[model samples]
Target: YVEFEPSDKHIKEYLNKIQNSLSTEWSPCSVTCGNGIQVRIKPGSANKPKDELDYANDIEKKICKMEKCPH
Candidate 1:
């Protein structure tokens, strides 16, 4: 005699990840000059849970320039 098993159980446990992408929170240009940098912070320790992965970039930096500087 032998025991047979068809299919195991299918358990669905979803803790899907979402984005804080395109929708960035940039505060300042870091300076009021010709070419300055813009920034956004991805919290690593204070606001969210560990299971929720968020930090893919350390400190987001981008190039930005306003009107003009003294020449």
Candidate 2:
């Protein structure tokens, strides 16, 4: 058996392929009175699926809240 090392170009291509597949989506704040909840959705799959339900199980949500707005 022969061992072959990956070239810089090949490695870059592979990195690009995986990088392109990553996705992040943000949701609007949940409230306006004070610090509100936001979500950073990161799906398990690379691309969007036919039905959102299909990836529902793989979806991840992260909450992001900020200081309350002064009236």
Candidate 3:
């Protein structure tokens, strides 16, 4: 699970890429960008789960610099 906070401008760009990549998978994974974007893998927890989370490079920086998210 993950959350984008104090959202940087590229968050949407990141989401768009993710959604498009998994478009065929009908991924329950979702995105909402108001105060922030909250995303989770349904049955998963906020902590690390399975493989590494995926997102665009710019958004990656915002997340990497963040101290915390949904976790």
Candidate 4:
């Protein structure tokens, strides 16, 4: 049975790698107020189903607290 096609399940395993790669390359936070948002790019498309997997050309953000602000 050398004609067996790749299973959809294998896609799932491969998809998670994409998910981590998507999130792992997150951009640095906007500022240093310990409350700034960081950006992430989806590489090709746009928007998402909120499934924690981003789509192409999408730039997302996350909060990062690094240091105290000087006043």
Candidate 5:
């Protein structure tokens, strides 16, 4: 007996079908003053894990700038 593998095209289609849609909104900055950082939520799945971190993995983090806080 021989094993069969899906073709590239079929793999692509399968990935597209299961791929999740990332959130459009950016999360609030982690810092309150000076330079700040923000992140976008991870893509969502129909069968998402209970723990957000599990689903999120390494969420997309973005850099942001803000005016310096008052002394």
Candidate 6:
């Protein structure tokens, strides 16, 4: 999985906003982690959670690749 080491303050602030978004009335089915934003496009018939995790990991990899991170 692709990982970026954002400052703790940034992480906290970003995650706080994400948490608020999750509380909305019409919520999208996905994972909201403090470190990354994930959108699950294809869900598994039997194991939705597992599929979501994979989607999140894929998101991390794709985004990190596009980003010009020092790491």
Candidate 3: residue 57 Cα off by (Å): 23
> Lowest-scoring 10 consecutive residues by lDDT in candidate 2?
53-62
Tens-digit lDDT track of model 3 for 2-62: 6635454545555555643432223332333223333323333224333554433212332
RMSD of 4: 14.9
Candidate 2: TM-score? 0.35
Score residue 30 of candidate 2 by CA lDDT.
Answer: 44
Question: What would the per-residue lDDT of candidate 6 be over residues 7-70, giving only the tens digit for each residue?
Answer: 4454334434454453213223233333333322232322333323332332221111123334
Q: Relative to the true structure, how large is the alpha-carbon lDDT of every model?
A: 0.41, 0.42, 0.37, 0.50, 0.47, 0.33
Q: Model 2, residue 19: displacement in angstroms? A: 20
In model 5, how large is the Cα lDDT of residue 51? 44
Off by over 4 Å in 2: 1-22, 25-33, 40-43, 48-50, 53-56
Q: Each prediction's TM-score against the native?
A: 0.41, 0.35, 0.22, 0.39, 0.44, 0.26
* lDDT of residue 32 for candidate 5: 66
Answer with 2 or 6, whichever has the higher lDDT: 2
Q: What is the lDDT of candidate 3?
A: 0.37
Would you give me the overall lDDT of model 5?
0.47
Please identify which of the two predictions, 4 or 6, would achieve the higher lDDT against the true structure: 4
**Candidate number that wins on TM-score, 2 or 6:** 2
In model 1, the Cα lDDT at residue 24 comes to 43
The lDDT ranking, best first, is 4, 5, 2, 1, 3, 6
Tens digit per residue, CA lDDT, model 2, 1-71: 55443344543343344433434564454445554333333555536553442323533333345576786
Worst 10 residues of 4 by lDDT: 5-14
Pairwise lDDT winner, candidates 2 and 5: 5
For candidate 4, list the clashing residue pairs, or say none: 44-56, 44-57, 45-56, 45-57
